[PDB]
Amino acid sequence: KPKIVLVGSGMIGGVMATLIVQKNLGDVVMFDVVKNMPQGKALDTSHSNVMAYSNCKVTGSNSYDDLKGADVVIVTAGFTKRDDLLPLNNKIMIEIGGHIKNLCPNAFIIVVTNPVDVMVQLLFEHSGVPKNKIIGLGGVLDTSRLKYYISQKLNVCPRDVNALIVGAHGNKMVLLKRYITVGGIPLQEFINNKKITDEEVEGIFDRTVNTALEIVNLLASPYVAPAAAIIEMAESYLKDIKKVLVCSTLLEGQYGHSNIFGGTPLVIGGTGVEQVIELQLNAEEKTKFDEAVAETKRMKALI
Amino acid sequence: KPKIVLVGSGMIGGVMATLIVQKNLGDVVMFDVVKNMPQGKALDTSHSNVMAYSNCKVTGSNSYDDLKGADVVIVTAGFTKAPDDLLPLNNKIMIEIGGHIKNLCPNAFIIVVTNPVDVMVQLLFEHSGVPKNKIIGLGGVLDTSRLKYYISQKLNVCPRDVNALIVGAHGNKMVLLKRYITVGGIPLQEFINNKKITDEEVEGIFDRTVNTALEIVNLLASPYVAPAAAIIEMAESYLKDIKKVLVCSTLLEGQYGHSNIFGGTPLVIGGTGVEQVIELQLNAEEKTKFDEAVAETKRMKALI
Amino acid sequence: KPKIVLVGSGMIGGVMATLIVQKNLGDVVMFDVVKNMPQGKALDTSHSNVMAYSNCKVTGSNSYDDLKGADVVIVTAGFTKAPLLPLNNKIMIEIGGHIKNLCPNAFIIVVTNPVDVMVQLLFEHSGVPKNKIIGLGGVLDTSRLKYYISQKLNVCPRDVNALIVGAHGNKMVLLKRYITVGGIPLQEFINNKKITDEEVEGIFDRTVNTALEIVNLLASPYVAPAAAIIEMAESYLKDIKKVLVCSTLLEGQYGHSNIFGGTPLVIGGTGVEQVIELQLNAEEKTKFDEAVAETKRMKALI
Amino acid sequence: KPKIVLVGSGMIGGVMATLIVQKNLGDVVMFDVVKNMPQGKALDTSHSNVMAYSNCKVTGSNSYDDLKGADVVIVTAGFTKAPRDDLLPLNNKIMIEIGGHIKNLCPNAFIIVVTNPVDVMVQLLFEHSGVPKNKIIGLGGVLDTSRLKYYISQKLNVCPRDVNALIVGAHGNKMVLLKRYITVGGIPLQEFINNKKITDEEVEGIFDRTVNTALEIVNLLASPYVAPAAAIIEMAESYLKDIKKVLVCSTLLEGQYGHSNIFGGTPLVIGGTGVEQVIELQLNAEEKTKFDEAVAETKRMKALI
DNA sequence: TTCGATTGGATTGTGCCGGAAGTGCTGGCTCGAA
DNA sequence: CGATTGGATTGTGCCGGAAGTGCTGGCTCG
Ligand SMILES: [Mg+2]
Ligand SMILES: [Mg+2]
């Protein structure tokens, strides 16, 4: 049975453990540097095996030694209370990286800690894992927002909207209007039929970009959709589903960029990243991609 | 709890009943004119509730009276032939079933499978009196399942991450719209440009899709698992108000320039039945193919 | 599509909304008296429809008006105390008035503690039929018992079956005689020394004190409670007719009337379809009496 | 991704491949000695990955070569009618052949035998394949008890899975139905009998129906394959996902119930290493006698190969 | 001897804890680094 | 000269035509 270690047992970590039990995906270690809290969350969550008809062990840990034998490692831990946080979190990535190198070098790694396109590269470098075995959360979450908003305007099933958002997670994310479909049909056909206007689409783009802030302004925090997105990625690996999912991955010349991680459609299968798909962007799209990657580079230079 | 009546309990009916219990979608009546056989199949299937943790009653019936109170009616009954003399026989069958739906469950959502489906669904529509948004025919979900699958195996992605539209009619004149294929939301043409798959291979896959039933029958098997799964995807989208976009046969009222006939097109299936009929903005060549499919449907409608 | 209203959008509410979308069970209104927060949680949760391939509307509300047309109402609101009767009574009065006015045909699940009192108060003030309102208790408590036993015997957790009756709280009645494993009496595993009588007693104590244990570990128990509640709600919404131990109005069972208590029930499409009275021996009956007496005692303090 | 080889692609095999795709459990090889048909079934079934959102390869095979690297092997192949005890040597022959291949090609596979009489055939395949006793079991109790559980649940109007029951000894007419061990929502059946929700006579009628179910279905011009396939997949899934379900299956007895060197139906725990526990029920005298009779019939047939 | 307390969190805040008030925080404590 | 442990509508080694809730004439393989 797979061993899944959640490095970070905060809000997103907790929902991830709950979903893993629901789906009977594997044993779970809820790790946190904070004492006792993850053991308490783990004890609560373990009882839900009964309701789920599952059998996943869910335990808490405050020791990185429990990374031993992990098949999947999901990193959410890090400071959130700004550029000033960058060296702090770098420190954490170094620490985690060391342990991965020593304890679970064959693990598949998903990084969530923000800014994710920086943090995922730092952990890649410090852990020594292969480029096909480490990715960052970005596109699956962002595009879930876009797909959902469009679906609500057009009154269709959310999953039947497809869309691509690339480059980076965060305010520089590249929303590609040209690549939106509904039930396989170009969005433009629905714009032509006046079911949705270009202005409404732009409003939805802005809302997609601003969604985390919208949720925080309402005195909540985004963790349910992020957790679900991360588990969709992990499951595609663990069950070798080969879903196309937009994640942050090492660029080796794609879009004209190297030595940097960026969001792009990827195929996630049993061996990890099995394909990196490079979209055939036009010049304005490429300029937006360049600006996203430039912001990632700028922040990386500040660690 | 929804009542689902399977009018026809052959091999497709057996798989549909199995899947309904797996998904705990509703009580099932397995109807057939053949005596005792559907009672036997229903008895076998009912025990699988234990393994599924479901609670769907599954019963067999040789009486149309059990259509009473049906929320969903799926019609697979009718004479078959391996892949025109059937048109009058199956017309008479649609008349009989229609009379019973009209009198026993006029509010049911109807899914027609009986071939040639684009003709038979209109005949049942006419003799049942149900509203145009409450009856559809199986076509696109099945055919596109083949297309999506074959492409996905050449590109090494999850089969459902391929999207495709096949329209017009269910049969040899099905319109396969190359322009509308995507993979993980990306136009297929980008994969052709990168030589991940060629134009010629896609042509070969179109031909294989059209001829898949024949391919399976030549291998001494009968296609019924994929058809059953497609039908249950449709029925579930209605029962759970999911509003999936699914290509099915529906009454055309001017779309693509045609009226008074049923044809395959993308539809939204929700709690009120067909909620939207989506007309694709086809170019001239695509429209010519659509025309040919609907013309074949018309040709056959003239032979009942 | 069913409409499910969560009256209370705290941490248990959040997990319930998450699970409802995962299972595509119905549209969800997350209500709370706290402004803006439930709209935020609802927004976050709504996006998970994509990942789940579901289509549930999830919205937030600070208005009881949105109870209108609810098929299921789950009440978790109320003041809490870490491991108030008049306060939460006033809340049950308010909510009850709105259910009576806006959704009198809803199926009601009460979680607000002490649950066996609060469920009766909401029953009285809402006017809903006795077969349409129950309290959370047994499904959660027995999930603890079943889990701990399964981990000592190394079997799938749900293959342990057990009944805990009477009340949800320290006076819960743990029926050792009714525990089975893969359908086999627990006593056979004790005879074979796969588990001891003493270990079973230690597990009973742990089950009773699990909320305290979780709080002592600096966490709040809300995942398993949310899952238990959704199992109950789902049994109603899909007419599954599961046997689930819940708090229900007693009308003579176990020698008691005019009070709610935990007993095995059948939950189906019409609500509580059967109330099953266990054939308890004298000792078990005395424990049941103690649980109910505590519920009555507290009911006198509203 | 696990490799599941279906040795036999008839009615039960077909439904098993359908369910494996529905549950995304693994790649499937539909083997049969009959040419072409399994390739056809596999082609049809493979398209259902789209509707199921799964990604299982489903292929057909007429060669035992494809047992290579199997993680799970499910054996339904064998004679069911004359080309009756006369079938026993024929099927023995088949078990010999399969066994050789398993030994050479997938000795680490988990094996589920369905070919009837299962309690005999499973031991023959055990002997000829050389796999460990914790890696091979026979279908029996999960199916038979699904019948008993279902009929009881319908009389009492509860969820079928909330009825628990144990049927032991052998899969066939000598199956041992244990009234003492029936519970409903975890409550002893006797409480429902005391409450006149169901009578002792009705329970006896249901026991008879449970024993007679296969015949009842055949008499109605059908054949049992949906519930058998579901039962088999429940067993296989408990192995593949390490669920550690308690499931009644046919397993090698080494003294339990007073028998050795024979397979019989008993509650087992199925986990990631195979049979993790064999649970011996503390049967009373009458129950143990019925168990004895079941095992005696298995031995009688085993003596005729 | 002084004085801050992990990348998390219940109702409130938030190193931990009890007592208190009641849609709701802080005064007193231990441990350990500087 | 009977035909793998399977099967569509029917039966059932295979295939094609025929009739129409529905089989068997003609063929070829070792
Ligand atoms: Mg902190
Ligand atoms: Mg044969």
Residue numbers in the entry:
A (entry chain B): 4 to 84, 95 to 316
B (entry chain D): 4 to 86, 96 to 316
C (entry chain A): 4 to 86, 98 to 316
D (entry chain E): 4 to 86, 95 to 316
Article excerpt on this structure:
In this study, we determined high-resolution structures of the pL1:PvLDH complex and apo-PvLDH by X-ray crystallography in order to understand novel ssDNA structural elements, ssDNA folding and interface features for specific pLDH recognition. pL1 folds into a hairpin-bulge contact by adopting three novel structural elements defined as a T-loop-like motif, base–phosphate (BPh) zipper and DNA G·G metal ion zipper. Therefore, pL1 recognises PvLDH predominantly via shape complementarity between inflexible regions and many bridging water molecules (bridging waters).
The pL1:PvLDH complex was crystallised under two different conditions. The crystals belonged to P21212 and P41212 at 1.9 Å and 1.71 Å resolution, respectively. Two aptamers were bound to tetrameric PvLDH in an asymmetric unit of P21212. In contrast to the metal-independent 2008s, pL1 is a metallo-DNA aptamer and the magnesium ion participates in the interaction between pL1 and PvLDH.
